[PDB]
Write a protein that binds this ligand. Structure first.
Ligand SMILES: *[C@@H](CCCCCCCCCCCCCC)C(=O)NCCNC(=O)CCNC(=O)[C@H](O)C(C)(C)COP(=O)(O)O
Ligand SMILES: *[C@@H](CCCCCCCCCCCCCC)C(=O)NCCNC(=O)CCNC(=O)[C@H](O)C(C)(C)COP(*)(=O)O
Lengths: 878, 881, 96
């Protein structure tokens, strides 16, 4: 072997007829589809130039071509491109930018993970149609033309966008540009200049003057069809198309476990040299490049089963090529001769890569697609004795032996006389992991995860995937598909999840998402920071809260089982019946422990079963006790005593005061309270900057409420037993401190934003005096939440039985002009047949950091379709 | 110590830059003189006032009115490359300049581009901008069929490979302003692989249209002042400028083995991308530092041994401080290091400044000095904190840290707009492993032959004038013999060619001025150099008094051959050859006239082959001329043909005035019909000289009476009195004696092809026996058919080797009949002096285009930097007036 | 004299100076980018190129009298940070 083998670990393409995926390309090739259509009126009026008489000046003989369903579409915002600059960008560059992202995602890699890598980019561009259209419109004066119409930035932008550091050059080698990029990338990876390579080309047809000019040369087909290797060959038809591949050194790819589609064992390039005419090919030059590539790959030509020829369909090009192949390949052993350009026309720049992609697919499925538009070879090739043949149907691999890996030969010959050839071998024998036992493939709901750049794109994405799952539901494994959508895709800003146990169930859910009218909204996080647990106070209790979770989640049930004896120890009460009875838990000695048990088990389930690391913890009222447990400051055996011992204490002062809710800032409330000479009523909880909770003497509290109602102020009393965070609790703190004298606080390991300490940023020591202070002092919950946002957290999920502070969090975030998400872990009478997977679905939708490895330990990548795009039409105009 | 790539030697460089710079040496003179090459935009391109606006950011207007412009962009030598005028009109000028400069690069390396046919030479050409495409679509000329190759970028490199018949990889590419040096990266990589043994790298810049300036001006790139104030505190942007530059690259072990001249060694090169950093065009400091240490690692060079950095130096207020701070982090670690940038002198030659920067680096290496930076007055205050050994030279500076233990090394950098950086480390050429310098040898100062060439007459005069100026300057820096060697075996001989004979350079300067000013019409060569000339050997009538006196005194080998043949005639004819050729009166009497003509003519052909290496591709003789032709082609030995001719002249000396030669313009068929009408057999066709000229031999009275018959009928039937009526029945009685008296010779097979007028078919090999000779004095001389078969074989150059040309006019006539352009040179003329021996024939033989053995004429010598020939540029452009 | 916004802003207590600025920025970037921005996600991934940075540079100069430079927006890569950078810069010059 002359060079290092290079593995094609990812492929991406956009091709005429709506083909935008390598798997979709294979289906069309196998079906024998013909993607050559009449020129859409959107490009130009074909009848303004069509003339069947050859060589008529100013007129073309071709009215056909292979066109993309749309070209002006480009998801500009997802790449941070403003419409003003996006409009002037050559569509060839935009399609390359999009398809390169598809190529990386197809490999199972997050493109954002490639930032800072030594990845190299090689893109070939041969047509300046958008430049000419801009010149005709006279819009060259726009400053964005400097970047929009230059050819170097076609690969520069891709490297700039993804933050790559390898070579990022753009070349132009005519119709062999697509395959030349693979040869250059295979060279660069071997030299060590890079560790990953993006190779391919793009061609876009927007102007008739390119077609008529070639028509005057007699190049294009009169019948408008690339009759490759047929007697009626009369020329080619230009066609749009963009295709890219991702290349990585084989030892690295095998070491890192990336899926390998095929191995490029060696490439070679050559020039036709001096010929009769500048565009005439040379037979001996083609024969030389064949032996050069085989020598570089170190493989005998007798073992190359299938040759993917150039096959443009020119009357003189094919006989030269056919003689070239017969002198090297097909030496006795049968050989199959194919050409992708028959099915979709000549893609020019990208024709090299598309031919390669067809070769990759043929290797994987082990068959050769029939060659469209073939009846017989030209009569002048009758005497050539060779093993070559043109398949007229889906044929098995011509060799059929097992001792030798399947190999193909890919060729591409440029107009300027530059030839490219590459030898591709099938992927290595899969390093199959130990077979998954039926116990590992547990029957149970799994999250299938979607993403897109907009609401409509998500609905389109769901529809596409639903049809794909409906086809491969027997061939694909549900475990792998769940793994692939989570661990092997890029989570685009607008995202959702569908939970199901079987693929048919998954399809039905996707169709509901496809036809649903819900306004899916973009995520607010970046997966860099974990969610912030919010532990609310009392009042969220509802009848039979824990019945569903106990019957569904084992860790939740286990947590209650461990904590139940402590309640029966300190308070002598059984929480299992209270949270499962038909009546809401009542009594402070019962209400507080019941809420505490649910919250801590909810947190316990989340970071153990679903492995969600909390980025920060925020506590409100007794929720601070739950907050301490999750933060690692205390053990559950301590806070349970803290809750239980405290809970029985204010049973003495049940009814010792009344609470009021004032929807005004606390600062002005304090000033008005001071100006009124009143000092028994104090601010209890600063819930939001626009709301305040007060408590004190029951009759007096009603008096300011009436004194606020006469001022038409929105105010309300709070129907709860104990005047917490007010001087009414005074007769207990001395007893409470003695009861908590045995508490052993520890330093918190999770960021703790206490609402009791004057500075929320302080990491508390949850000693006895804290809870004494917590009950007496006011709660600056809005301040603590505000502090967490200032630190950068944006996702808050409250773990109470019912949402009570989610509205407060949203108000505080809005008061800071900050985009935040307020999720609810549980809701009153909300059925959750799938357990807490609903919250996990919501947390991912918001964008909190997750340990997807814990949810999806291992699995094989599969071919799930990539997400759609928010294709806004961005084209020049006159 | 570790070198991960093979060192690559730059064996040839060529460029075309603004201000009439057409050669690397002329670039060096400009840099030392501190020339500023940017000018106001010429009205020929566009009206600059139609777009100028000093206010930055104004829509639809450009802030700069200056640029560096080539003196002639539309100029192209279409016919030399075999491209029709129509096709060349629609070819992008970037492609046309690349084709011309690449040819200049190959010649500058000392190689004939025709010798690269079938080689594995690779071609990488950087190329940005599409101004001609913009112009073409504005004029609406895209319907032309030639556009498919004229405007497609891939043909830019494909055309070079197609023209020269190169088989290595050939591609063009775009990497913004770093494409020029990126070509060197790919070429070094391709050579390292073994894919190629020669590589052309470079780029082209062309500035035909204004909107490119307007679009960039809105972005704020364009400099308001109009000069690239590289590394100056007043930097405000760059200025675009035209320019093309190409280099030729070869593996260093191969360059040493073949003995090619090395200008510099590219030890290593590397490239990378800036990555995600602010805006698309904002450069990254850390990326620049990475490529420096990567290139050094690949080249195995520590940075402290690099003394000069050819920085990118665009002149933007953002780019320059990033460059300086990045360089100070790598280079100049305590040791002084000199900064520089070719951008300052000639603006930004986008997509080619990478190569132009490289070329400046090589010239600095060979001359060992750092050119001053033009507009530098003070570094920006932002860089006052940076501590470094770097410094910007304000005058011609000796090489920093100059020493012999460490070879001089240069770092070349070039950064593109897309963010792709290229950086290469260049070392001086290895210590000259030349032959003993000024060693004794061919120290003779005899007049040497200096060769000129071009594509047209007016081009030759321009070429002579340019070379005359160059020789006038370097008359002391180089030896005359080396210049003669360079022009002969180190250049490509274009169709229009001539030579000048001189003994010393001062005479040469006078000679070129005569050629540059003379109104001589220099016709292009008719030969392709494939086949050697065809010697022509004549009959009687060429003799004149004291012919060889000057030749005997000017060609020692001629004299040796004359002396060699002297004894045999002194035995067979009894008289010394020097008598007839040195007497003050013309030799008379066939017994001495005939041997004398044969003796000189044989030595003449001997003089060409032994002394001037002129191997004849074919040989043709006439009458007596077959004897001389037989010796030269190898059909018979030298002395044996001598006894052959003296015996004949003596044997027919028995008769005087045996008959007559009626020479008529009538065709042989027509005179045969006329003779049949006359019915006499006393006269016979003796010589078929031309299709429009026939010679009739026979009895005197039958000739004289009958030739008057055409003279009454107004027919061009002249005759000059001759001693012998050969090829006629008048010599028949002596043939029996002649058939045996000279039968002692032993003919053998010629080693050279022979066309014989004696045989019916000249192409047949003639056995030079007496019977064949007896045919010669009797059979009709079929000379016209003899030369006809020669040109049917494609031979083109015919030289008449006779004291006076007699049959040359016949060659032109038959060539005119054949509609086939041929050369009819004459070896020597009547009374014509020979101040330089037969060198006057050789210069004409070269001008005709025959095959020559230049190795024999020019055994050895070092190549020189003599200026390349000027092109016949024609104004080819697209107009929308 | 200075823009009407600058008179109002200084007359207001300095603690909301970030809040009022954080809007002069959101509105101005919204019209420049033609997209309702958010106050925390970075400009560069909105597509704020070098030109748009100039339009921001000149506009804030008219509205606040502060000479912004393109490196600063490159450093204060988000609106909240940029408004924060404007706040103390206003505070520092005021204290002079
Ligand atoms: C790719 C060809 C790419 C170039 C032509 C299509 C694009 C539009 C024109 C270029 C841009 C113009 C400027 C902007 C508007 C390709 O695959 N081509 C065919 C490859 N075949 C091949 O090389 C051999 C085919 N050649 C011939 O059949 C033969 O040379 C001709 C019939 C074409 C010419 O014959 P003659 O004129 O007698 O030499
Ligand atoms: C050369 C840069 C490219 C010059 C030629 C561009 C001509 C237009 C090409 C497209 C065709 C349009 C016409 C179609 C008919 C170069 O040498 N690049 C390296 C240095 N160049 C830089 O830009 C580096 C310094 N950059 C800057 O100063 C800033 O990024 C600029 C001023 C560009 C933007 O400032 P803003 O980001 O603060």
């Amino acid at each position: 072997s002359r060079v290092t083998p290079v593995a094609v670990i990812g492929m991406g393409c956009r091709l005429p007829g709506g083909i935008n995926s390598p798997d979709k390309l294979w289906e069309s090739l196998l079906r024998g589809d013909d993607l050559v259509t009449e020129i859409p009126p959107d490009r130009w009026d074909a009848d303004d130039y069509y003339d069947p008489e050859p060589g008529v000046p100013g007129r073309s003989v071709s009215r056909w071509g292979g066109f993309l369903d749309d070209v002006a579409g480009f998801d500009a915002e997802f790449f941070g491109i403003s419409e003003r600059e996006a409009t002037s960008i050559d569509p060839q560059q935009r399609l390359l930018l999009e398809t390169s992202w598809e190529a990386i995602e197809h490999a199972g890699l997050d493109p954002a993970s490639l930032a800072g890598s030594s990845t190299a980019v090689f893109t070939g561009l041969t047509h300046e149609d958008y430049l000419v259209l801009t010149t005709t419109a006279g819009g060259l004066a726009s400053p964005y033309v400097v970047t929009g119409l230059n050819n170097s930035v076609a690969s520069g932008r891709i490297a700039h966008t993804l933050g790559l550091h390898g070579p990022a050059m753009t070349f132009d080698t005519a119709c062999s540009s697509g395959l030349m990029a693979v040869h250059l990338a295979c060279r660069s990876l071997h030299d060590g200049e890079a560790d990953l390579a993006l190779a391919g080309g793009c061609a876009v047809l927007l102007e008739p003057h390119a077609s008529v000019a070639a028509s005057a040369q007699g190049m294009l087909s009169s019948t408008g069809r690339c009759h490759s290797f047929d007697a009626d060959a009369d020329g080619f038809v230009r066609s749009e198309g963009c295709a890219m591949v991702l290349l990585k050194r084989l030892p690295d790819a095998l070491r890192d476990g990336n899926r390998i589609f095929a191995v490029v064992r060696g490439t070679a390039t050559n020039q036709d040299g001096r010929t009769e005419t500048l565009t005439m090919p040379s037979e001996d030059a083609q024969v030389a490049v064949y032996r050069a590539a085989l020598a570089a790959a170190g493989v005998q030509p007798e073992t190359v089963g299938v040759v993917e020829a150039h096959g443009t369909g020119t009357p003189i090009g094919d006989p030269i090529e056919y003689r070239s192949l017969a002198r090297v390949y097909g030496a006795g052993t049968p050989c199959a001769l194919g050409s992708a350009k028959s099915n979709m026309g000549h893609s020019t720049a990208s024709a090299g890569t598309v031919g390669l992609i067809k070769a990759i697919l043929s290797l994987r499925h082990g068959v050769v697609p029939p060659l469209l538009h073939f009846n017989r070879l030209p009569d002048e090739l009758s005497d050539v004795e060779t093993g070559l043949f043109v398949p007229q149907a889906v044929t098995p691999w011509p060799n059929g032996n097992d001792h030798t890996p399947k190999r193909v030969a890919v060729s591409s010959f440029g107009m300027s006389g530059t030839n490219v050839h590459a030898i591709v071998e099938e992927a290595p024998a899969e390093a199959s992991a130990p077979e998954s036992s039926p116990g590992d493939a547990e029957v149970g709901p799994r999250l299938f995860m979607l993403s897109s750049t907009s609401s409509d794109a998500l609905r389109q994405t769901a529809r596409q995937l639903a049809t794909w799952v409906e086809e491969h539901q027997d061939c694909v494994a549900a475990s792998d598909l769940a793994y692939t959508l989570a661990r092997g895709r890029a989570h685009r800003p607008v995202r959702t999840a569908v939970v199901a146990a079987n693929l048919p169930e998954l399809v039905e859910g996707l169709r509901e998402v496809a036809d649903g009218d819900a306004l899916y909204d973009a995520a607010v996080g970046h997966g860099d920071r974990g969610p912030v647990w919010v532990f609310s106070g009392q009042g969220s209790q509802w009848a039979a809260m824990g019945t569903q979770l106990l019957a569904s989640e084992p860790v939740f049930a286990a947590t209650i089982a461990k904590l139940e004896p402590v309640i029966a120890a300190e308070s002598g009460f059984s929480v299992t019946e209270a949270i499962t009875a038909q009546q809401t838990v009542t009594g402070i000695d019962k209400v507080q422990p019941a809420v505490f048990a649910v919250q801590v088990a909810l947190a316990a389930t989340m970071e153990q079963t679903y492995g969600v690391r909390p980025g920060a913890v925020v506590g409100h009222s007794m929720g601070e006790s739950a907050a301490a447990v999750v933060a690692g400051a205390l053990s559950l055996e301590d806070a349970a005593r803290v809750i239980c011992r405290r809970s029985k204490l204010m049973t003495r002062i049940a009814g010792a005061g009344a609470m009021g809710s004032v929807e005004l800032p606390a600062k002005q409330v304090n000033s008005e309270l001071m100006a009124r000479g009143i000092d028994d009523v104090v601010v209890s909880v600063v819930a939001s900057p626009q709301s305040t909770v007060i408590g004190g003497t029951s009759d007096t509290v009603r008096d300011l409420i009436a004194r606020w109602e006469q001022r038409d102020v929105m105010a309300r009393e709070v129907a709860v037993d104990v005047a917490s965070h007010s001087p009414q609790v005074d007769p207990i703190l001395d007893d409470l401190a003695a009861a908590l004298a045995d508490i052993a606080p520890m330093t918190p390991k999770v960021p703790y934003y206490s609402a009791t300490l004057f500075d929320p940023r302080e990491q508390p020591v949850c000693d006895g005096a804290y809870w004494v202070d917590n009950l007496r002092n006011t709660v600056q919950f809005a301040a603590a939440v505000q502090a967490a946002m200032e630190d950068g957290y944006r996702v808050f999920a409250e773990l109470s039985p019912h949402p009570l502070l989610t509205h407060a969090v949203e108000q505080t975030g809005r008061s800071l002009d900050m985009s935040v998400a307020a999720l609810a872990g549980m809701r009153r009478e909300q059925p959750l047949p799938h357990g807490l997977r609903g919250l996990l679905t919501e947390l991912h939708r918001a964008g909190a950091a997750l340990d997807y490895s814990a949810l999806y330990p291992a699995g094989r990548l599969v071919d799930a379709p990539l997400p759609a795009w928010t294709h806004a039409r961005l084209f020049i105009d006159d």
